[PDB]
Write a protein that holds these residues in place. Structure first.
Motif, PDB file in Angstrom:
ATOM      1  N   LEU A   4      -5.272 -10.038   3.912  1.00  0.00           N
ATOM      2  CA  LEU A   4      -5.362  -8.854   3.079  1.00  0.00           C
ATOM      3  C   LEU A   4      -4.700  -7.667   3.767  1.00  0.00           C
ATOM      4  CD1 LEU A   4      -9.139  -9.180   2.063  1.00  0.00           C
ATOM      5  CD2 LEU A   4      -7.077  -9.895   0.723  1.00  0.00           C
ATOM      6  N   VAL A   5      -4.162  -6.768   2.950  1.00  0.00           N
ATOM      7  CA  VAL A   5      -3.600  -5.514   3.458  1.00  0.00           C
ATOM      8  C   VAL A   5      -4.165  -4.374   2.629  1.00  0.00           C
ATOM      9  CG1 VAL A   5      -1.453  -6.519   4.372  1.00  0.00           C
ATOM     10  CG2 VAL A   5      -1.486  -5.533   2.055  1.00  0.00           C
ATOM     11  N   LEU A   6      -4.253  -3.216   3.243  1.00  0.00           N
ATOM     12  CA  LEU A   6      -4.736  -2.009   2.601  1.00  0.00           C
ATOM     13  C   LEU A   6      -3.559  -1.110   2.316  1.00  0.00           C
ATOM     14  CD1 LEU A   6      -7.087  -0.043   1.950  1.00  0.00           C
ATOM     15  CD2 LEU A   6      -6.931   0.716   4.318  1.00  0.00           C
ATOM     16  N   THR A  20       3.859  -1.798  -7.994  1.00  0.00           N
ATOM     17  CA  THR A  20       3.188  -0.526  -7.891  1.00  0.00           C
ATOM     18  C   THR A  20       1.828  -0.660  -7.320  1.00  0.00           C
ATOM     19  OG1 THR A  20       4.507   0.451  -9.682  1.00  0.00           O
ATOM     20  CG2 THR A  20       2.364   1.436  -9.292  1.00  0.00           C
ATOM     21  N   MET A  21       1.447   0.211  -6.397  1.00  0.00           N
ATOM     22  CA  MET A  21       0.089   0.187  -5.866  1.00  0.00           C
ATOM     23  C   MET A  21      -0.410   1.614  -5.708  1.00  0.00           C
ATOM     24  SD  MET A  21       0.949  -0.901  -1.917  1.00  0.00           S
ATOM     25  CE  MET A  21       1.836   0.238  -0.985  1.00  0.00           C
ATOM     26  N   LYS A  22      -1.717   1.735  -5.595  1.00  0.00           N
ATOM     27  CA  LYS A  22      -2.390   2.988  -5.340  1.00  0.00           C
ATOM     28  C   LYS A  22      -3.042   2.940  -3.975  1.00  0.00           C
ATOM     29  CE  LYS A  22      -1.764   5.059  -9.388  1.00  0.00           C
ATOM     30  NZ  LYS A  22      -0.791   4.111 -10.076  1.00  0.00           N
ATOM     31  N   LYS A  23      -3.081   4.098  -3.308  1.00  0.00           N
ATOM     32  CA  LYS A  23      -3.771   4.231  -2.056  1.00  0.00           C
ATOM     33  C   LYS A  23      -5.186   3.648  -2.217  1.00  0.00           C
ATOM     34  CE  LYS A  23      -5.379   7.617   1.271  1.00  0.00           C
ATOM     35  NZ  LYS A  23      -4.864   6.927   2.456  1.00  0.00           N
ATOM     36  N   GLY A  24      -5.613   2.828  -1.260  1.00  0.00           N
ATOM     37  CA  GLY A  24      -6.933   2.224  -1.279  1.00  0.00           C
ATOM     38  C   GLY A  24      -6.976   0.854  -1.903  1.00  0.00           C
ATOM     39  N   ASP A  25      -5.920   0.441  -2.594  1.00  0.00           N
ATOM     40  CA  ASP A  25      -5.847  -0.902  -3.117  1.00  0.00           C
ATOM     41  C   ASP A  25      -5.843  -1.912  -1.978  1.00  0.00           C
ATOM     42  OD1 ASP A  25      -5.662   0.051  -5.743  1.00  0.00           O
ATOM     43  OD2 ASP A  25      -3.506  -0.477  -5.950  1.00  0.00           O
ATOM     44  N   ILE A  26      -6.454  -3.067  -2.238  1.00  0.00           N
ATOM     45  CA  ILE A  26      -6.494  -4.176  -1.295  1.00  0.00           C
ATOM     46  C   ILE A  26      -5.624  -5.282  -1.882  1.00  0.00           C
ATOM     47  CG2 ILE A  26      -7.942  -5.872  -0.157  1.00  0.00           C
ATOM     48  CD1 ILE A  26     -10.184  -3.703  -0.369  1.00  0.00           C
ATOM     49  N   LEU A  27      -4.526  -5.571  -1.205  1.00  0.00           N
ATOM     50  CA  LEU A  27      -3.518  -6.498  -1.695  1.00  0.00           C
ATOM     51  C   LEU A  27      -3.556  -7.777  -0.875  1.00  0.00           C
ATOM     52  CD1 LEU A  27      -2.271  -3.429  -1.598  1.00  0.00           C
ATOM     53  CD2 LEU A  27      -0.462  -4.375  -2.745  1.00  0.00           C
ATOM     54  N   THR A  28      -3.094  -8.866  -1.484  1.00  0.00           N
ATOM     55  CA  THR A  28      -2.947 -10.119  -0.749  1.00  0.00           C
ATOM     56  C   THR A  28      -1.525 -10.207  -0.203  1.00  0.00           C
ATOM     57  OG1 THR A  28      -4.602 -11.192  -2.051  1.00  0.00           O
ATOM     58  CG2 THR A  28      -2.975 -12.617  -0.970  1.00  0.00           C
ATOM     59  N   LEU A  29      -1.400 -10.489   1.067  1.00  0.00           N
ATOM     60  CA  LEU A  29      -0.091 -10.586   1.743  1.00  0.00           C
ATOM     61  C   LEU A  29       0.483 -11.967   1.510  1.00  0.00           C
ATOM     62  CD1 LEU A  29       1.998  -9.224   3.497  1.00  0.00           C
ATOM     63  CD2 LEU A  29       0.625  -9.866   5.472  1.00  0.00           C
ATOM     64  N   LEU A  30       1.708 -12.035   1.005  1.00  0.00           N
ATOM     65  CA  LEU A  30       2.415 -13.284   0.808  1.00  0.00           C
ATOM     66  C   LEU A  30       3.484 -13.559   1.838  1.00  0.00           C
ATOM     67  CD1 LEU A  30       2.844 -12.974  -3.059  1.00  0.00           C
ATOM     68  CD2 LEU A  30       0.997 -14.190  -1.840  1.00  0.00           C
ATOM     69  N   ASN A  31       4.251 -12.557   2.241  1.00  0.00           N
ATOM     70  CA  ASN A  31       5.358 -12.798   3.169  1.00  0.00           C
ATOM     71  C   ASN A  31       5.622 -11.505   3.934  1.00  0.00           C
ATOM     72  OD1 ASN A  31       8.084 -12.965   4.242  1.00  0.00           O
ATOM     73  ND2 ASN A  31       8.338 -14.784   3.039  1.00  0.00           N
ATOM     74  N   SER A  32       5.423 -11.555   5.241  1.00  0.00           N
ATOM     75  CA  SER A  32       5.615 -10.421   6.133  1.00  0.00           C
ATOM     76  C   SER A  32       6.721 -10.678   7.139  1.00  0.00           C
ATOM     77  CB  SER A  32       4.321 -10.027   6.849  1.00  0.00           C
ATOM     78  OG  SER A  32       3.799 -11.119   7.545  1.00  0.00           O
ATOM     79  N   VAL A  49       6.726  -4.310  -1.410  1.00  0.00           N
ATOM     80  CA  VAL A  49       6.357  -2.921  -1.120  1.00  0.00           C
ATOM     81  C   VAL A  49       6.835  -2.634   0.308  1.00  0.00           C
ATOM     82  CG1 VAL A  49       4.350  -2.919  -2.643  1.00  0.00           C
ATOM     83  CG2 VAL A  49       4.054  -3.424  -0.169  1.00  0.00           C
ATOM     84  N   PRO A  50       6.968  -1.369   0.668  1.00  0.00           N
ATOM     85  CA  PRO A  50       7.377  -1.068   2.036  1.00  0.00           C
ATOM     86  C   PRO A  50       6.270  -1.444   3.014  1.00  0.00           C
ATOM     87  CG  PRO A  50       7.726   0.828   0.590  1.00  0.00           C
ATOM     88  CD  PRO A  50       6.867  -0.139  -0.155  1.00  0.00           C
ATOM     89  N   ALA A  51       6.636  -2.105   4.101  1.00  0.00           N
ATOM     90  CA  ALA A  51       5.685  -2.476   5.129  1.00  0.00           C
ATOM     91  C   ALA A  51       4.967  -1.278   5.710  1.00  0.00           C
ATOM     92  CB  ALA A  51       6.399  -3.253   6.244  1.00  0.00           C
ATOM     93  N   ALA A  52       5.665  -0.155   5.814  1.00  0.00           N
ATOM     94  CA  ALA A  52       5.071   1.039   6.392  1.00  0.00           C
ATOM     95  C   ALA A  52       3.963   1.635   5.523  1.00  0.00           C
ATOM     96  CB  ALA A  52       6.162   2.081   6.582  1.00  0.00           C
ATOM     97  N   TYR A  53       3.854   1.234   4.256  1.00  0.00           N
ATOM     98  CA  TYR A  53       2.863   1.776   3.349  1.00  0.00           C
ATOM     99  C   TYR A  53       1.572   0.957   3.339  1.00  0.00           C
ATOM    100  CZ  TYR A  53       6.123   4.993   0.818  1.00  0.00           C
ATOM    101  OH  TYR A  53       6.999   5.984   0.474  1.00  0.00           O
ATOM    102  N   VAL A  54       1.481  -0.119   4.103  1.00  0.00           N
ATOM    103  CA  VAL A  54       0.286  -0.940   4.101  1.00  0.00           C
ATOM    104  C   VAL A  54      -0.152  -1.200   5.524  1.00  0.00           C
ATOM    105  CG1 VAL A  54       0.805  -2.028   1.903  1.00  0.00           C
ATOM    106  CG2 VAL A  54       1.510  -3.169   4.002  1.00  0.00           C
ATOM    107  N   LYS A  55      -1.400  -1.613   5.702  1.00  0.00           N
ATOM    108  CA  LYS A  55      -1.939  -1.989   7.002  1.00  0.00           C
ATOM    109  C   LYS A  55      -2.634  -3.318   6.840  1.00  0.00           C
ATOM    110  CE  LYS A  55      -5.444  -0.197  10.118  1.00  0.00           C
ATOM    111  NZ  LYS A  55      -6.678   0.644  10.241  1.00  0.00           N
TER     112      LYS A  55
END
Length: 58
Positions: A4-6, A20-32, A49-55
């Motif tokens: 998961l990524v935030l 498109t995502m919103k701050k605070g969304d919890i996304l599933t990571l497929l390919n990093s 999405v940009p890697a820099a926008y998620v953790k």
């Protein structure tokens, strides 16, 4: 591992291979494998999405 990524910031898709995502969304990571653009799933849409926008959460 849950893979998961935030979302740290809002992001608006600019191309049909992005999502498109919103701050605070919890996304599933497929390919990093790319340092700049990560493929994620947010509900029933998958795209970049940009890697820099998620953790990674763990």
């Amino acid at each position: 591992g849950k893979e998961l990524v935030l979302a740290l910031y809002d992001y608006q898709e600019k191309s049909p291979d992005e999502v498109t995502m919103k701050k605070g969304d919890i996304l599933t990571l497929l390919n990093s494998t790319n340092k700049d653009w990560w493929k994620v799933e947010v509900n029933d849409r998958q795209g970049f999405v940009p890697a820099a926008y998620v953790k990674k959460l763990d």
